[PDB]
Ligand binder design. Structure first.
Ligand SMILES: OC[C@H]1O[C@H](O[C@H]2[C@H](O)[C@@H](O)[C@@H](O[C@H]3[C@H](O)[C@@H](O)[C@@H](O)O[C@@H]3CO)O[C@@H]2CO)[C@H](O)[C@@H](O)[C@@H]1O
Ligand SMILES: OC[C@H]1O[C@H](O[C@H]2[C@H](O)[C@@H](O)[C@@H](O)O[C@@H]2CO)[C@H](O)[C@@H](O)[C@@H]1O
Ligand SMILES: OC[C@H]1O[C@H](O[C@H]2[C@H](O)[C@@H](O)[C@@H](O)O[C@@H]2CO)[C@H](O)[C@@H](O)[C@@H]1O
Length: 587
């Protein structure tokens, strides 16, 4: 069992014959002697030296009297012959920047994954993710301070739950030194950032999300090698972890254990339910373009998780059309369960950006997503990458005056939530923030203060979209099966009306129709598959969302009148810049 190196390396409480303390391990094959320097030592590297094992390269020692809560470090003389005070690379807890000293804590008890949390991860479940940067979601008013893990527990959790999300997704909670990396430049892979409290506080947070029936996804960064505070480079005077631009040595067997351990750790000692790997492209590129050993790392890691912690899943963002990212290793490979649908994000946003008068020439931007839908298990993501650095907010991409911007954005969420593939939405998007995301400030919650306005409208819509999406299997059962989606009207470019059906395993279908110009369509007849009585269950133009409240205003019965190659049809009102969903009424 060499998969969980965190259960042996680093600081672990133990008792050597009646006397208790903590036994330290590391791993610096070369090094040149290493001692342990903590609060128990008066910080003196002459009192405690460590005995090196030759085969494993691990220096070890059992200090009695040294207890949980005490800072410590490693004083080593490196291959070159230099004085170094290194941070434990298996630090489960670190100190407030500035800026290193590891802390003596052990391992959290350990979380058995529940059946219901496993069910929530499956390809047939509704999965709607709220993506959040913990340092910019909310702040206290007086002082602009972070909310702690426990405060986030009282506030972020009840909020995402009420908004009807199934998953919470966190930007990296890796200890990281600069708020500006957003957590993507780590220096302590096994310690939750101290920014928001203790590691037990982080754990309580996760327990609370679960108690509310949310799954939790963690951004995992085994692909960004540490580059700050000399935290991991030339560990023992040699290129222990990196290579001869700093990039992990996924080939060396102990580096691999390190990274795979890290995954098993989050999932097993915190109960994390899934992990997301960013920038997969820059892990596998730069023997062909490909970095063969990096590809193997991911295949392997996925296999190991699939075997060790089945029920947990992995997702990936990969920026080139690398085949089979979310397909099994015996074949394509990589072996992720889910892939970010970046192509969709770009196509649909480019579509929404157009002056509606020009949408008739870019219809392919909305239809195209179906052609490659069954090549990958997709998540439709409106993530943090899309609302920084001059890209604008999602709202601000929309054309026209304010009332047309909101309407476009409503119609789009309508479409997004009905279109095959899971859902991801970055905080602030749900209430249509105007400004870009600022990791250095709270979101613009002041937009929701005072009388009911257009921002509340969207927030209500997103909630109703989640709850409605979760209620009806057709919207979510068969994302990844051709049977789950079928065009009713794919070729109305000249009016920019698009209509499809979603379908569950039992063959029940929901009709989804979108009108992407501001011209209301009345008596719009299209062919259908299940004749009978149809009723709106969702309408982005409802006054409940500050729409004009146009629509069908009741049950509508189909006619036996051929249309679009079908024998029966519906003749509906399609509100301007809106999408609606209809269900069939039992008789
Ligand atoms: O790039 C490949 C492909 O893209 C474009 O084809 C479009 C079709 O013109 C359009 O009808 C639609 O195709 C749909 C089918 O009609 C429908 O029955 C179902 O089977 O799948 C499609 C749903 O998206 O969309 C595609 C993509 O925009 C382009 O115009 C073609 O020349 C080209 O072969
Ligand atoms: O429909 C896509 C494809 O995905 C699944 O395979 C998963 C597998 O469950 C995991 O072990 C891991 O390796 O990810 C794989 C995809 O990368 C389905 O089981 C499979 O039937 C399906 O073809
Ligand atoms: O974060 C909670 C806080 O949000 C709002 O105030 C924000 C403001 O909207 C931001 O643009 C920025 O200036 O930070 C402020 C808080 O530090 C609400 O107005 C406020 O009531 C709410 O508690």
């Amino acid at each position: 069992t060499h998969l969980r190196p965190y259960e042996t390396l680093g600081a672990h409480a133990d008792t050597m014959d009646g006397v208790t303390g903590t036994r330290f391990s590391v791993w610096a094959p070369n090094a040149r002697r290493v001692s342990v320097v903590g609060q128990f030592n008066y910080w003196d590297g002459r009192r405690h030296p460590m005995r090196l094992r030759k085969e494993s390269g691990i220096w070890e020692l059992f200090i009695p009297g040294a207890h949980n809560g005490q800072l410590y470090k490693y004083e080593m003389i490196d291959a070159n012959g230099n004085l170094r005070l290194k941070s434990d690379p298996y630090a489960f807890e670190a100190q407030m920047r500035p800026e290193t000293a590891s802390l003596i804590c052990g391992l959290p008890e350990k979380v058995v994954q529940t059946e219901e949390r496993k069910k929530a991860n499956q390809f047939d479940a509704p999965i709607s993710i709220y993506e959040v940067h913990l340092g910019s979601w909310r702040r206290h008013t007086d002082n602009n301070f972070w909310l702690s893990y426990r405060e986030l527990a009282d506030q972020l959790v009840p909020y995402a739950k009420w908004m009807g999300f199934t998953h919470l997704e966190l930007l990296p909670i890796n200890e990281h030194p600069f708020d500006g990396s957003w957590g993507y430049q780590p220096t302590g892979l096994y310690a939750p950032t101290r920014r928001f409290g203790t590691r037990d506080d982080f754990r309580y947070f996760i327990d609370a999300a679960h108690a509310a029936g949310l799954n939790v996804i963690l951004d995992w960064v085994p692909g960004h090698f540490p580059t700050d505070d000399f935290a991991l480079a030339e560990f023992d005077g040699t290129n222990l972890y990196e290579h001869s631009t700093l990039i992990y040595n996924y080939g060396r067997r102990e580096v691999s254990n390190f990274l795979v351990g890290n995954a098993l750790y989050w999932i097993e000692r915190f109960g994390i339910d899934a992990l997301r790997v960013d920038a997969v492209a820059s892990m596998i590129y730069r023997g062909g373009r490909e970095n063969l050993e990096a590809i193997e790392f991911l295949r392997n890691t996925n296999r190991i998780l699939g075997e060790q912690v089945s029920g947990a899943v992995t997702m990936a963002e990969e920026s080139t059309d690398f085949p089979g990212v979310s397909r099994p290793q015996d074949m394509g490979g990589l072996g992720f369960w889910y892939k970010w649908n970046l192509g969709w994000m770009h196509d649909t946003l480019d579509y929404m950006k157009l002056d509606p008068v020009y949408r008739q020439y870019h219809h392919d931007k909305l239809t195209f997503g179906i052609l490659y839908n069954y090549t990958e298990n997709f998540v439709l993501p409106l993530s943090h990458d899309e609302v920084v650095h001059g890209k604008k907010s999602i709202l601000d991409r929309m054309p026209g005056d304010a009332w047309q911007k909101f309407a476009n954005l409503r119609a789009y969420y309508g479409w997004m939530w009905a279109f095959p593939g899971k859902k991801l939405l970055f905080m602030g998007n749900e209430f249509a923030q105007g400004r870009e995301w600022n990791h250095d400030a709270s979101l613009d919650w002041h937009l929701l203060e005072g009388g009911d306005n257009w921002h509340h409208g969207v927030q209500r819509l997103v909630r109703d979209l989640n709850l409605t999406y979760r209620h009806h299997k057709a919207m979510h059962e068969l994302d990844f099966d051709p049977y789950g989606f079928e065009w009713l009207v794919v070729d109305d470019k000249e009016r920019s009306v698009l209509i499809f059906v979603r379908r569950d395993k039992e063959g029940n279908e929901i009709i989804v129709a979108s009108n992407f110009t501001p011209v209301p369509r009345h008596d719009y007849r299209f062919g259908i598959n299940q004749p009978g009585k149809w009723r709106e269950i969702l309408n982005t133009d409802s006054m409940h969302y500050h729409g004009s409240n146009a629509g069908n205003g009741g049950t509508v019965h189909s006619d036996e009148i051929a249309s679009h190659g079908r024998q029966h049809s519906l003749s509906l009102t399609l509100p301007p810049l809106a999408t609606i969903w209809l269900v069939r009424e039992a008789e």
